[PDB]
Design a protein around this nucleic acid. Structure first.
Lengths: 205, 123, 80, 150, 129, 80
RNA sequence: CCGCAGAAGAAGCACCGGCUAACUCCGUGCCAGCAGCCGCGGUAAUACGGAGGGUGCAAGCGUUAAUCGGAAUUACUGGGCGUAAAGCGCACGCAGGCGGUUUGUUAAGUCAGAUGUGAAAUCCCCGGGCUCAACCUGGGAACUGCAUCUGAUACUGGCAA
RNA sequence: GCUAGUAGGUGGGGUAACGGCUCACCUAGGCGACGAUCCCUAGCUGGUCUGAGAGGAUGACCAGCCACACUGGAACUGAGA
């Protein structure tokens, strides 16, 4: 499913925000965040092992918007390559169009970044798409269209873009609403909350 | 055994057999009913469980536990075998699924809609 | 009996044809004798979608076996 | 730097006339990025000090590596009960292989990428006692010296 | 006396190795001679001498590092009633990466490492780490 | 070149025919142990004179009688 | 591919006692019923029923049947037999399996190489083509194998001494 | 425990071709526990599924092979039924 529900309520028991309605707000601003989303359908305790072990598996899973199947499949291409299995996986996960656009400042929210690509206002190269996954690669060209240098939603997401460092492996152009995905990601510096060893144990039978 | 012994007689192989009494050939088979009975399970403190001989076409007149909240069945009626069992009854091979045919959605289990053939409620 | 022929291996509403020497007592998708070619009717730019050999379209046509109209018209346009 | 965690934690029943006699004992994890030995109990009357005293006593003694560059060079075997536990090499470009009790001791022993599996019954109490039987079976460079120098 | 010669050899070798014996003896044959070189070169025996009498016998002198020469791997592989063979690249890739494994080749008796790129397959009688 | 196959007579009585049993090393598949899996074939002697243990050369050809396809090509040696 | 209004027309299904992530309040009271297994309920049920809430999956979700896996629990890889399941009550011996030690010979087993062949499809290695993906596809390797042709003689077997 | 064109040999005949395929005569052999004979069940294969592998299971679509067309039997023309 694409969700469509109460973003920030998740934050509470996520114990992290991970970009839920970022633009003016984050934790404990006009919202009740860092609680438990139950009265006593769920409330804080010591935590189980297996809790953690499931939660973190979903941590990595949710900040791309990938379904059940997909992320496993990426694992079946990684453990088919003779290179690093850990690296490869997070490499394939960032090939999704929706993730790339957010990191070119297009969308102030992860959900919003993916809700751009939906309405016809995106394109890649001279090709028009409306597909939230694509093959994104070195020296591609991320392109805004005509009647998307016209929408007042897009502009209103450049605000936050001035407030996020933006990656160094892509050119980013907001002045003509382009930017190229000129070279491969670095994850020498995004594995900072990601322990690959954990998840790949679990996936294994 | 010795490799020379195995060359002459390779290892015996296990066989396959299941909870349903023949491995059937359906997951759901329509069987007719002989009569519904009600035994008490093992121990004199276990609650009475609604059982029934079936009148299968296979010539298996065996005994099926009947779930849900009571029933509205008649004793010649044509029911879908789950092929579960419940473990407090002795000697069980079958358990009855509900939804379709004579057996249909039990009352106030619109929460377990997948079970029993209860539609989603529309309130 | 064996003949030069084309032979779909495309999926639905994809016309990827392969020129085979194949039987008329089995089929164009059945028992092959051999491939001999690839052909695009749509003239795709993929890696080697057009092959048609020189050597077997000059040896099994020696002892006879006829080709197809696109092929006939292709002998000239690869200037073979 | 010191590494320690816990494994089991439980209680024991004994009887003395009509006793139920619950006394909180446990198994714990010891290592140091090299591996250490020790795994003791510590009787207690509360769940926190059952693991507390258990770790005191499980800090006793150390045992050395046989890895080079994060992994063992050699497949080696030992035994203790039906816990039979084997390993073999695992090349670089992999994560940390194996679940069960041999997940946690197969990190703390300085290793992060080596193959493992356990044949037979896994009896957690003594898979531990079969895993350290591999730090006596080693093809570390001193053995290369023990054919070339010796 | 012996039906599988070599099995009797190794048995009395490990049995004696552990008791740190000075030497043990058992009836020699051709092969028993040819093996004792690898044990001698890698350093597990001082030397070995065949005193031809009523019969050849191998009184091989047992070497010790410092009260040990313990070896962690052994088998009876190609032996009576189960003689078997392997080709030149199907030789065992044993521990240490430098480990040994007596193989008779098709010209002599060598070992896995040499034997490999020597083009030479053969029966492995055993395997060592 | 040609192929001639080493059999041993082990039943000669009938005129102009010798029964041979051919023992080749058959290996077990799963347990990898060689064994003698003897197999009679019916060889035609030009004149019967054999018996028991006579190594011979046979070879594959046309039949001459029913269950034939074999001839005597040479008697390596005799043992009757 | 262009235009046209208008969030409009587009969420469900199971589960939350332990294995196993995910509970409260009521009603019921070893009854009703629940239940893959271990097992639940005797009127203050995290296990039954409803409600509230919580959890996992999502245009599907859950249940069953069925096959392999886990199960190295039929074991060549990879199993036991004093007492846990298993050693005939004990000898003899035919077939079968097995053969001390040295030399000569042979090359069948065996080792090496060569050559065919090992269908297409399928796997993999490398690489493309469809708006992506699904799907489509090129070339290489694999095709573990088998027969054939020629050599090798350490071991295994035959023969001779 | 099995086998009378049964096992084999001559000479006849027949097939597109090799063959007891069939016959006349002649010999009395042949086969078998390395499992004959008989009994149960099944189309077979590339492959397929699962599985670390070995293995087990399996044979759907797709390709190849084989077999069958109301039942049984039979022949005709033809390179081909």
């Amino acid at each position: 499913a694409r969700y469509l529900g109460p973003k920030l309520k998740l934050s509470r028991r996520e114990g992290t925000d991970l970009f839920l309605k970022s633009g003016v707000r984050a934790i404990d601003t006009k919202c009740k965040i860092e609680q438990a989303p139950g009265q006593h359908g769920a409330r804080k305790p010591r935590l189980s092992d297996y809790g953690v072990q499931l939660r973190e598996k979903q941590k990595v899973r949710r900040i791309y918007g990938v379904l059940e199947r997909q992320f496993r499949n990426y694992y079946k291409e990684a453990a088919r390559l003779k290179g690093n299995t850990g690296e490869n996986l997070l490499a394939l996960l960032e090939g999704r169009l929706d993730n790339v656009v957010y990191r070119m400042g297009f969308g102030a929210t992860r959900a919003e970044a993916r809700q751009l690509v939906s309405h016809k206002a995106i394109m890649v190269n001279g090709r028009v798409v409306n597909i939230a996954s694509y093959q994104v690669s070195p020296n591609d060209v991320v392109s805004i269209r005509e009647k998307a240098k016209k929408q007042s939603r897009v502009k209103a997401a450049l605000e936050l873009a001035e407030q996020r460092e933006k990656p160094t492996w892509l050119e980013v152009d907001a002045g003509k609403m382009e930017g190229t995905f000129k070279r491969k990601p670095e994850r020498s510096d995004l594995s900072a909350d990601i322990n690959e060893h954990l998840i790949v144990e679990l996936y294994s039978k | 055994a010795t490799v020379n012994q195995l060359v002459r007689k390779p290892r015996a192989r296990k066989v396959a057999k299941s909870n349903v009494p023949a491995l059937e050939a359906c997951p759901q088979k329509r069987g007719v009913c002989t009569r519904v009975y009600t035994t008490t399970p093992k121990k004199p403190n276990s609650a009475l469980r609604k059982v029934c001989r079936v009148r299968l076409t296979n010539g298996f007149e065996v005994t099926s536990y009947i779930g849900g909240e009571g029933h509205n069945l008649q004793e010649h009626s044509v029911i879908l075998i789950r092929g579960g069992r419940v473990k407090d009854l002795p000697g069980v091979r079958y358990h009855t699924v509900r939804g379709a045919l004579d057996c249909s959605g039990v009352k106030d289990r619109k929460q377990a809609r997948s079970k029993y053939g209860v539609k989603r409620p529309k309130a | 009996m064996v003949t030069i022929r084309l032979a779909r291996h495309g999926a639905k509403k994809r016309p990827f044809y392969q020129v085979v020497v194949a039987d008329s007592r089995n089929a164009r998708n059945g028992r092959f004798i051999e491939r001999v070619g690839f052909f695009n009717p749509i003239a795709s730019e993929k890696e080697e979608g057009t092959r048609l050999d020189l050597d077997r379209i000059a040896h099994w046509v020696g002892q006879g076996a006829t080709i197809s109209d696109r092929v006939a018209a292709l002998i000239k346009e690869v200037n073979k | 730097e010191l590494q320690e965690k816990l494994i089991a934690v439980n209680r024991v029943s004994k009887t003395v006339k009509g006793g139920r006699i619950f006394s909180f004992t446990a198994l714990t994890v010891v290592g140091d990025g090299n591996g250490r030995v020790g795994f003791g109990y510590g009787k207690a009357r509360e769940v926190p000090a059952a693991i507390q005293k258990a770790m005191e006593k499980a800090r006793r003694n150390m045992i050395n590596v046989a890895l080079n560059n994060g992994t063992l060079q050699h497949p080696v075997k030992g035994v203790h009960t039906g816990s039979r536990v084997f390993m073999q090499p695992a090349s670089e470009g992999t994560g940390i292989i194996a679940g069960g009790a041999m997940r946690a001791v197969l990190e703390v022993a300085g290793v992060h990428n080596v193959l493992a599996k356990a044949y037979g019954s896994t009896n957690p109490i003594n898979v531990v006692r079969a895993t350290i039987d591999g730090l006596e079976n080693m093809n570390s460079p001193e053995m290369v010296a023990a054919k070339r120098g010796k | 006396s012996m039906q599988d010669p070599i099995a009797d050899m190794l048995t009395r070798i490990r049995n004696g190795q552990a008791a740190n014996k000075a030497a043990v003896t058992m009836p020699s044959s051709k092969l028993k001679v040819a093996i004792a070189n690898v044990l001698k070169e890698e350093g597990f025996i001082e030397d070995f001498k065949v005193e031809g009498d009523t019969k050849p016998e191998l009184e091989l002198t047992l070497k010790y590092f410092q009260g040990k020469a313990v070896v962690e791997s052994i088998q009876r592989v190609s032996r009576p009633g189960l003689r078997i063979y392997k080709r030149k690249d199907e030789l065992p890739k044993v521990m240490a990466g430098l480990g040994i494994a007596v193989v008779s080749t098709s010209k002599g008796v060598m070992t896995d490492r040499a034997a490999r790129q020597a083009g030479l397959g053969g029966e492995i009688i055993c395997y060592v780490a | 070149k040609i192929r001639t196959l080493q059999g041993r007579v082990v039943s000669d009585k009938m005129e102009k025919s010798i029964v041979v049993a051919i023992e080749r090393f058959v290996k077990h598949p799963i347990y990898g142990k060689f064994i003698k899996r003897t197999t009679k074939l019916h060889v035609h002697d030009e004149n019967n004179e054999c018996g028991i243990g006579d190594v011979v050369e046979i070879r594959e050809c046309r039949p001459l009688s029913k269950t034939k396809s074999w001839t005597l090509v040479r008697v390596v040696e005799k043992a009757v």
